[PDB]
From a paper:
Ryanodine receptors (RyRs) are large ion channels located in the sarcoplasmic reticulum membrane, which control the calcium release from the intracellular store. They play a central role not only in excitation-contraction (EC) coupling of cardiac and skeletal muscles, but also in learning and memory. Insect RyRs have drawn a lot of attention since the market introduction of diamide insecticides used to control a broad range of destructive agricultural pests. Here we present the atomic-resolution crystal structures of wild-type and phospho-mimetic RyR Repeat34 from DBM (P. xylostella), a destructive pest devouring cruciferous crops globally.
To gain more insights into the molecular mechanism of this phosphorylation regulation, we have solved the crystal structure of this domain at 1.85 Å resolution. DBM Repeat34 domain (residues 2836–3050) was recombinantly expressed in E. coli and purified to homogeneity using a five-step purification protocol. There is only one molecule in the asymmetric unit (ASU). DBM Repeat34 is a horseshoe-shaped domain consisting of five α-helices, two β-strands, and three 310-helices. It has a clearly intrinsic twofold symmetry as previously reported for RyR1 Repeat34, but the symmetry is partially broken by the extra helix α0′ that is only present in the second half of the domain, the difference between helices α1 and α1′, and the difference between loops α1-α2 and α1′-α2′. The two halves of DBM Repeat34 is connected by a long flexible loop previously defined as “phosphorylation loop,” where the classic phosphorylation sites are located. Second, DBM Repeat34 has an extra helix α0′ that is not observed for all three mammalian Repeat34 domains. This peculiar helix α0′ is right in the middle of the phosphorylation loop and behind the flexible portion. The surface of the domain is mainly negatively charged with a small positively charged pocket located in the inner side of the horseshoe formed by helices α1 and α2. Third, there is one glycerol molecule trapped in a positively charged pocket formed by residues from helix α1, helix α2, helix α2’, and loop α1-α2, including Trp2870, Lys2874, His2892, Arg2894, Arg2908, and Lys3028.
Numbering used by the authors: 2838 to 2930, 2952 to 3050
C-alpha cells in the first residue's frame, strides 16, 4: 500500500545559527507568499475564505501570531533536520495603489528575489527529496488522525511519486526556495 515513513531525525538538534536561518527564511517566505497572493487578487480578511480570496495571514510578519509564524518555520525546520539526519553538512561559509489596498496594514512585501539564482541539478534532486519528506510527514499524521477517529480515507494519501505536479507544488516550491535562500545567505551544503 502506502506506509509513509519520514526521515529519522534522531539526535539532530539545530544550533543558534541554523535556528536563525530558519527564522530569516520564514520571514522571507511569508513576504514571498504574500506578494504572490496580492498579485493574484487576494486581500486581508478576518476569516479565511477560498471563495472571496480573503486571508487572515495577509499582514506584515510582525503582526502574525506564533501559530501563523510556525506555519512557515515548522516545515523549514524539519527539512533542515532531515538534511542533517541523512548526512549533509550545512557550512555557514513606486507603491502600487491597487496592491496597497490588499490590506489595511500599509503592507507592500518586497522580499529578495531568488528567481535570479539557479540551483544545481543535485540541489533540485534534494529539493524533491525534501518535498517528498514533507508529504510523508503530513501523510503519517493524517493517517494517524483518521485511524484514531475510527477510519477514513483521503485522496492524497498516496506515495509522493503518485501526486500530481499541482499537488506537489506547495512543498516543492518551499524546498527549492529554501535551498536558494541558503545559497543567497552564504551557506554551503556538502553531500555525505
Ligand atoms: Cl519571531
Ligand atoms: Cl490536511
Ligand atoms: Na536513530
Ligand atoms: Na526540485
Amino acid at each position: 500500500q502506502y506506509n509513509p515513513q519520514p526521515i529519522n531525525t534522531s539526535s539532530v538538534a539545530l544550533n543558534n545559527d541554523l535556528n536563525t536561518i530558519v527564522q530569516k527564511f520564514s520571514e522571507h517566505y511569508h513576504d514571498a507568499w504574500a506578494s504572490r497572493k496580492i498579485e493574484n487578487s487576494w486581500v486581508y480578511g478576518e476569516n479565511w475564505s477560498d471563495s472571496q480570496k480573503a486571508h487572515p495571514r495577509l499582514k506584515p510578519y510582525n503582526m502574525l501570531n506564533d501559530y501563523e509564524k510556525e506555519r512557515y518555520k515548522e516545515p523549514v525546520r524539519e527539512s533542515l533536520k532531515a538534511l542533517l539526519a541523512i548526512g549533509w553538512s550545512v557550512e555557514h561559509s513606486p507603491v502600487d495603489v491597487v496592491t496597497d489596498s490588499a490590506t489595511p496594514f500599509n503592507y507592500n512585501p518586497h522580499p529578495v528575489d531568488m528567481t535570479n539564482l539557479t540551483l544545481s541539478r543535485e540541489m533540485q534532486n534534494m529539493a524533491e527529496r525534501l518535498a517528498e519528506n514533507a508529504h510523508d510527514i503530513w501523510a503519517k499524521k493524517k493517517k494517524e488522525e483518521l485511524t484514531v477517529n475510527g477510519g477514513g480515507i483521503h485522496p492524497q494519501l498516496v506515495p509522493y511519486d503518485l501526486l500530481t505536479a499541482a499537488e506537489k507544488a506547495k512543498d516543492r516550491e518551499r524546498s527549492q526556495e529554501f535551498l536558494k535562500y541558503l545559497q543567497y545567505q552564504g551557506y554551503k551544503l556538502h553531500r555525505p
